Amino acid sequence: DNSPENSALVIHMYDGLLQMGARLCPTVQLEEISNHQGLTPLKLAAKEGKIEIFRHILQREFSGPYQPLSRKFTEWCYGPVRVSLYDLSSVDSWEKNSVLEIIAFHCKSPNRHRMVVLEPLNKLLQEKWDRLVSRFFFNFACYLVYMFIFTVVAYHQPFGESMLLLGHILILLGGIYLLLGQLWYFWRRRLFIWISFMDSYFEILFLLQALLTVLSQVLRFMETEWYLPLLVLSLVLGWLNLLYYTRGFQHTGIYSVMIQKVILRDLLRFLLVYLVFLFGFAVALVSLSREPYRSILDASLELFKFTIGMGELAFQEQLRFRGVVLLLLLAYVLLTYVLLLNMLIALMSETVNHVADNSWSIWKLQKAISVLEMENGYWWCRRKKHREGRLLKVGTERWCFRVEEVNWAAWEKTL
């Protein structure tokens, strides 16, 4: 457990058992045994969200006869700077079900954004991101060019005929490409969408957009006009998808945006309440109208348009019983004002209590997910095989990773 006393007790017992097992049985390695799920103790700790024991296992050092069973080997320290040599087997390359892959996709605890900031994983992810930012921006540019072509073709379609036909063919090809890519992604990552829809909804939207545009092209070949609406949708949604790329050119994303995006767990209840209000009052009003307003849809749309300031009520005219229609309208207006005020207060209560100034960790987690996904390469041509090379083997026979730390506080406290 994350409580300090439980963490201390479990750490002490873990180290004692490891040392005793090394002393009695020096030939067997107890930390390489996997359960029926195929998880070692380190991977299990990463998956279950136990941050304290996971961190302790990740960076532990022993001096003396217990040196071999250590994961961090301090090489040399000058001043407040220390050059340590951490150990791998938590690396994406050459290994399936890595620690980083489990943290990003399989883990579901709220602490997963605080686990990517640990010392070896931080530098590993930073190096991978610095390597792959070029492909990230190349993909951005390709999508932007596709969107410009799509917008121009849609706008200029009320020598030129050949250009329009070529544009339509390219739009169909791009839609097919995006559809296939998103289908492959959803095939590979079925469970991640269910676990963590909060930070993976864009993968849905893209797919949807692709599907829509493909359908539109089909409707253009059947000589029906109904292609025009769908295509228009496929336009606007596409532009919104560009916002997905705001995470590559250094936009933190703000903690407040996360606050609103997580408050939408309360959308269902408020939506149900508002729907009950709207479809009770509309039915009452159309019942008074009988002696047109025959449709429930007409009255509901009129009230909804008034609510968002898009129209006027205009129910006050005639209707004979003009003293009751007024009462119903005022009751509806007051109730919806109360509901909106309740929405606002419920939303705002979080920002005045939980400061949680940790946008950097969330941005790092987003970058980690992006680089993990794009290391596999494109669906039509899988990338070159994941090279295990992170740093040369050190005898300490172990694939290691050199990290440099600076700590003025620790240097000043010691003497």
Next chain:
Amino acid sequence: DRDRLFSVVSRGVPEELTGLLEYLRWNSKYLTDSAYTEGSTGKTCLMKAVLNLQDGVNACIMPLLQIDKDSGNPKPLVNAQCIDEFYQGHSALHIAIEKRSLQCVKLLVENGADVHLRACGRFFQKHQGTCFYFGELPLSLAACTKQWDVVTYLLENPHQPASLEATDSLGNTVLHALVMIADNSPENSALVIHMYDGLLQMGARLCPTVQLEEISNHQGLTPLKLAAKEGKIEIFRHILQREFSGPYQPLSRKFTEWCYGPVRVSLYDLSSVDSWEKNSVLEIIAFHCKSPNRHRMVVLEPLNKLLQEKWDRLVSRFFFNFACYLVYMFIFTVVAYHQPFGESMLLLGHILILLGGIYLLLGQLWYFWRRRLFIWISFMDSYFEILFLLQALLTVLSQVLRFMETEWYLPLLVLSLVLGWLNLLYYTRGFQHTGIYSVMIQKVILRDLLRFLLVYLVFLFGFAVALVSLSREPYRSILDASLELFKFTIGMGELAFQEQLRFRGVVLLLLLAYVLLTYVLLLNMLIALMSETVNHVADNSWSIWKLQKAISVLEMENGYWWCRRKKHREGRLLKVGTERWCFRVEEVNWAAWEKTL
């Protein structure tokens, strides 16, 4: 390498086996000039020997004497790493000092060690890799590591003494190095203050003729000016007001004259004064400094009173300039309004407007020439200087367009009118408006304007394109639809897209989607803005107002561009023998008086 792997026998007699093996290679007596220095790429045997630290007393004296008794020409210490990899001149004496081994450095300086030669650890570039900066000198390294014994041995070393005024490649001295590594944490501040005072006293004792605090680096900054520029408030404050009783009285900056009760009359020291000195402490704090702490540095005891006196002197000219600008604005407004005997009045008004525009343009051009870097560093509290300039430029252009007999002067002139009135708000800081911390909160949140503007532009120009695409079977223009949606957003118009358009069920969906998205965006804006006022109370509007007044008085002490003011008079208070231009300040502290008895 080879010697290291042959020196793996720690216990026993390792002093003689290496000597027997080495001698003079037993075959090349005179070939050791260059064939000896090839064991590694810079890590010589001596560095490994002093880096071992395997035993309590490492075997280092006798091998050094053995090499000294037979080799006199090949100095090993003078050789340094010529390759960027594996340090760039890191001598073994630095390792000896920093491993807290007085014996090792003592034995090294017994024979052949050259102190204060070079370290090239990190100055500006080249040697990098999150390295350690300590002034790249052995004495500076000893001082920064809190090693009094090493420093004491180095200063009065009988063999080779180390000068305390030595400068490194960057021009810094030991005091500059202590200033650079300073941090606002209490323990770091206490350590650096103690080391600074100890070094100052020791330098006074050993060398009473030199003054270490008047030495400037390549940038021309003394330790006090460097501390002011780098934003290290603690050491800057300690240096600003320090007093010593006894033989160390002369090297003090504050001299308490007389105290009655809770009131004390102290006599602070200058050389932080604007007048008679270029690159003063106040000038550096106001313009060159960029740390967030600059608004907390102007409230210190001598600077506060100095700035208050200067403001009390120059408020008259401040309000005179205000009155002149107000009169100019009234003339401009009347001339613009009454232009659909009188002809002569209108011509005179136009001539005066042209002259005022030229005057303002020249003044702002002079200001921008003098203060190029300040605009880039601190645009947050200096944007008015831009606006004025812009306005001036505009009005001048308008006058030109009036002489070409084109009507296009009328729009520009109108702009030059409205902007001018807004510029009057600049003068609200003179007649005692604090400005409110909340206004600063909004003015600093506009760092987030670019992201929200990009998001809103994407929304608007996606939805407008979709709507005009549906309109085709007028609304032909993207600009028309974008303007219509934008006008609806700010409550300036109505949508009116619901009429006809055949596909009336999709236009409605697009409009509702746009409205909901823009409401969500505005709510996000509001929550992001308001989150700061409920967490950071920061009730320090007085300091920000003092900083604004300081910038204003600093700028206006120079006088007008057409006639520079009378030369800055050094006179702040008469010279006191304590021969030093001083400044008398009176403090009252009931808490300190009550605590003491």
